[PDB]
Amino acid sequence: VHGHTAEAAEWYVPPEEYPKSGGVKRYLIDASMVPLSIMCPSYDPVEYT
Amino acid sequence: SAESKDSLAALFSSGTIVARIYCEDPRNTDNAWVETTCVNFHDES
Numbered sequence A: 001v002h003g004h005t006a007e008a009a010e011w012y013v014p015p016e017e018y019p020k021s022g023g024v025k026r027y028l029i030d031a032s033m034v035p036l037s038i039m040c041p042s043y044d045p046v047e048y049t
Numbered sequence B: 001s002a003e004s005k006d007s008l009a010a011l012f013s014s015g016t017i018v019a020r021i022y023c024e025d026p027r028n029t030d031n032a033w034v035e036t037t038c039v040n041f042h043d044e045s
Helices: B003-011
Strands: B015-022 B035-041
Antiparallel strands (some): B015 B035
C-alpha cells in the first residue's frame, strides 16, 4: 500500500528547553543517532545541575 | 486515498497464511503448473 516499511522503532528525543531551568537548552541530536551501538562522533552534551 | 489507504494498511496488518496447495487450474501442463499460497485478511469489526 505504502511502498516502504515502517522503519521506526519510535526512539525518544527529549525537548530542547529543560523544564524549570530558566531557559537552559540541551545539545540537540536526531532520533537516528541515539543508541549506544551507533558510533555518533559529534556527541557533545552539556553538563547542567 | 491517503488515510483510508492507511485504514486499508490496518486491514492489511493482520493476515494469516491459511494454505499452500496445488491448483486444479485448466492452463496447467506437464512442464508448468500453478501452486497457490492463500492469504486471509479477516475484518472482525
